From a paper:
Assays were conducted using WT [name], along with the point mutants [name]-H230A, [name]-H235A, [name]-K80A, [name]-K232A. Of the four [name] mutants investigated only [name]-H230A was found to be catalytically compromised, with barely detectable activity for 3-methyl glutaconyl-SNAC and significantly impaired activity for 3-methyl glutaconyl-CoA. Surprisingly, [name]-K80A and [name]-K232A both display catalytic activities akin to that of WT-[name], with no evidence of functional impairment. In tandem with kinetic assays, the crystal structures of [name]-K80A, [name]-K232A and H230A were determined. The active sites of each of these enzymes displays the ground state “closed” conformation as observed in the WT enzyme, with no evidence of significant structural perturbations within the active site. These data thus imply that the observed kinetic effects are not attributable to global or local structural reorganization within the enzyme as a consequence of the amino acid substitutions made. Crystal structures of the mutants [name]_K80A, [name] K232A and [name] H230A revealed no significant changes in active site architecture beyond side chain identity. We thus propose a His230 dependent mechanism wherein this residue has a dual function both catalyzing decarboxylation and to act as a proton donor to the decarboxylated intermediate 7 to give the reaction product.
Residue numbers in the entry:
A (entry chain B): 1 to 247
B (entry chain A): 0 to 235
C (entry chain C): 4 to 249
The structure:
């Protein structure tokens, strides 16, 4: 991309891999990662030949969510989580996206992956919707997509308590996602993308449009509710203390 | 035996009726004879309120194989069109609880027909697939509604988009809510469960089932009209 | 009093149901004491997490035999003394640490908690239909809501008994532990919850459960409608007389 922290590779004629590789920030949503992700998805939107997208990280990190400075900015009231929308990239994509989460998925980074149509976790990586550890309520559509993908009950615990779970922990709690050794996750994503690429692209886009119509319809109102909750929770001095203390 | 002798009704006791699909020529694909005999079997059940539980099941290694190969080809090549049909929703429309004892493979519309049952039992060794997209077509027969409803939104996306084949053992490891057993144990477990259902007053079974599946019965027609439109949007 | 209130650390409140005579069935005393325990929590804005739990081998045993016979005769209805929604109506997160058996309305009351823990050795059942009547107490809403549509169908229609270990293998999203570990794990989760600001726990829980709170009243009316059709038959009175405690 421009900032070189996203690499696009056309794996086959109809499969595009979006690899996040902001090594300086461990795939946290730095300004560079934020700009390069939006540019990668726009590229995919401008080039309607692909049948599947693989979204993945580097080494041990899938995506680590807001930077410390990003979160402090929202605490200060300078910015809101909706300012740059990275959470809904894979939902807004017209073709199926596979979030190959071979490494850790933290906060916004985990939630961005959960909006993909197929999610794969690594057994030995850590996944957390850790918003509430810092004193504020989950944003980035976490309160809609977590129950939608992992189910109402596990979502309560994940969102209220902001705990960290190994992929193996989630596998044992019964999640519908494929969970694999980290070394196998991207290979499995490629094979699944090859299978998807056996279909006509128009059938994949028509089908996904139908399957995720209710998510696209329902998400704006939840985003407005989460912004309301941020109004009521984010701006407290103790949120600043927790971000600085516990990040 | 129903008219064409490809569905057999067997009273297990008093109050339990087994509907056994056995179109061996077509491996329980939706031939004309199986379509007719299935509709005739569920009409018989509706006319005979002595039953409290139904067990729908196949023969040997086949539960139900969905569209015939000839039928699918004729659609693919424009000789015919996808219609709406009774079959997928027979178990939902039935007044009393239906157990789909899927002791054999459930393919396409065959799988989907089983999923509309109130209780679904799979076989570990069998293959289950919503394979519509392998033919190039978007899924019909209410698949886009009933697969997310029974197997959850996330696994439904994979099943429906990729049209892959899952062994029962694979789905069991993925976390499905259905009992998964060896094939040789599927029908006996279904008869045990039907016996326990038949301990209940029939009016309470029916009253409860009406309430639990009301949202499915209410929402399904709109989804069918949506699936019909997707077929139009993917045929020039 | 058959409920004891124990403070744990600074802000965790344990509600322990201890009606030993009735094995935590909804006796008049348990009913009144539970209602008052949650009113006490409602009036105390110190607490951040509730642990609702039973004693020894019992979490909660559901309607007493006389309680069921009183609805059968049409003297009462399940909606008369609302225990079913106690955890849902509580403004802070509630953990149902079901270290013992959860039977009928006692299981359903527990399922309304934000976090549910089962015990491997214990028995859980929505057993309404065993007595011939349809499930009340919000069970047709909360069972599919917590355990998913498909498993809820089998649980509610068939009124079967499941060990915690059986539910664990069928794939439930709740943590299932040996009985002797259930309460200790709930305490550790409650300590983790107590790390957050109370206003963030309340704000978030209000949002997450708003759909339950909004939708529950319509389903309770529907369940009353079903009880009008099913509860008041002689064979229900025979089954309650003959099958209660099996």
């Amino acid at each position: 991309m421009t900032h070189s922290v996203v690499e696009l590779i056309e794996i086959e004629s109809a499969i595009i891999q979006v690899k996040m590789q902001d090594r300086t920030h461990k795939n946290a949503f730095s300004q560079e990662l934020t700009d390069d992700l939006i540019q990668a998805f726009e590229y995919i939107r401008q080039n309607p030949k692909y049948k599947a997208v693989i979204l993945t990280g580097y080494d041990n990190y899938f995506a680590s969510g807001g930077t410390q400075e990003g979160l402090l900015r929202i605490q200060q009231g300078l910015t809101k989580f909706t300012d740059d929308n990275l959470y809904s990239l894979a939902l807004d994509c017209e073709i199926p996206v596979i979030a190959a989460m071979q490494g850790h998925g933290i906060g916004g980074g985990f939630v961005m992956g959960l909006f993909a149509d197929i999610v794969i976790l690594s057994r030995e990586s850590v996944y957390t919707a850790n918003f509430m550890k810092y004193g504020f309520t989950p944003g980035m559509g976490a309160t809609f997509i977590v129950p939608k993908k992992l189910g109402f009950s596990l979502a309560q615990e994940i969102l209220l308590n902001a705990g960290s779970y190994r992929g193996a922990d989630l596998e044992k709690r019964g999640v519908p996602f494929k969970v694999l050794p980290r070394a196998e996750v991207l290979d499995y994503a490629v094979e699944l993308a090859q299978e998807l690429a056996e279909k006509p692209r128009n059938s994949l886009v028509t089908l996904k449009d139908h399957l995720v119509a209710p998510l696209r319809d329902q998400l704006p109102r939840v985003i407005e509710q989460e912004l309301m909750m941020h109004e009521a929770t984010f701006h407290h001095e103790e949120v600043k203390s927790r971000i600085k203390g516990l990040y």
